[PDB]
Design a protein around this ligand. Structure first.
Ligand SMILES: [Mg+2]
Lengths: 220, 214
């Protein structure tokens, strides 16, 4: 608190040379490296800022590798819960957070199946991840959806093909996009599980439920 | 010994061929058949390479810089086409069934004429035991390797041969360097330029790179 942070200052200064001007520096479990969040991804940086390596980092001590970068990011993820468009399941067995795009093919398929996911005990929470870019057709539309009085109704309507009624908001979609990139999201839909594990591509309700049951059993 | 690292890797089905120091205290550079992993001494944490030194004016990929030792150790099984007045040396992962590899090769004199020496290693895109692998094994086992390579590239067939070369060694090093296709051009500090590049473009990039890395 009254403790100076010379070394984190070296990290910021180093990244600045690389054009990376906005950073969030936290601890990493690897001795001599810090976790460094940027808009373009997570970087592991030595304390002195001289060596950099792209995330993610794995803990392989247990029976399966866990992505500790994503486990760490679950804190940032869960802290956007009031901006998530949530479809809760009656007796929740599992919660997933999906990065979605209203022009995304399998995002349409997934949303169509929302009832089936919910029937299986799976709650789905959406964050926005527009392919086209951080300033484009989908990105602006999704800002309007996210700022609606009833996000569920708005989202359902766009996905149904009814178009989107505009609105303006505190929410910056760019926050969702950066979290996604940090998590390693390389396209939509991107399904993020409770410990930050990002599922490879789309899984429908039956397969997802099966996978969630095992993921839960084999993660602490 | 690095027992903990090796134990961790074995749990994952990974085969280490070399474990050595890294710029990070308590973390090792681990060379595998699928790439370079950075692994803590205690066997617990892993980050996939490469690592970058960002202290100088320009970032350097230190993983590939380190790998240049492995690369240069293989100098005697490279097929070398030296430039009369050598100003740069590049190493090229090639495949005799790769279209741009023939384009690159047929311009060998023009690269040489600009002062660029080209050294080949084999990278059979279709993996080991493939026909490309076999033909290139035989090529690399010829007594006149340049004669054999030119002739295969010119369509005059490949004389069968056996020797100490194990193409898998070339392939693995390529994968470690980050080679994901042929031809792949490797500069004196391990920097990889993917795909064919013409003589003039290559000469320009080499001059820029040399200025940046001195
Ligand atoms: Mg640390």
């Amino acid at each position: 608190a009254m403790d100076p942070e010379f070394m984190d200052a070296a990290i910021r200064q180093s990244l600045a040379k690389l054009g990376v001007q906005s950073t969030e520096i936290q601890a990493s479990p690897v001795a001599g490296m810090k976790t460094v969040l940027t808009h373009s991804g997570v970087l592991y940086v030595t304390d002195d800022g001289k060596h950099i390596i792209q995330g993610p980092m794995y803990d392989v001590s247990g029976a399966h590798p866990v992505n500790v970068t994503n486990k760490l990011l679950m804190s940032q993820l869960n802290a956007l819960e009031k901006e998530m468009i949530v479809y809760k399941a009656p007796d929740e067995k599992h919660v997933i957070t999906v990065f979605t795009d209203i022009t995304c093919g399998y995002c349409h398929k997934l949303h169509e199946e929302m009832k089936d996911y919910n029937a299986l005990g799976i709650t789905v929470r959406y964050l926005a991840f527009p392919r086209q870019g951080l300033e484009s057709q989908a990105e602006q539309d999704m800002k309007s959806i996210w700022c609606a009085k009833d996000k569920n109704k708005a989202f359902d309507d766009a996905m149904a093909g009814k178009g989107v009624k505009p609105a303006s908001c505190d929410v910056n979609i760019a926050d969702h996009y950066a979290l996604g990139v940090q998590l390693g999201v390389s396209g939509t839909p991107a399904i993020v599980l409770s410990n930050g594990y990002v599922v490879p591509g789309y899984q429908g309700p039956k397969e997802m439920k099966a996978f969630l049951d095992e993921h839960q059993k084999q993660t602490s």
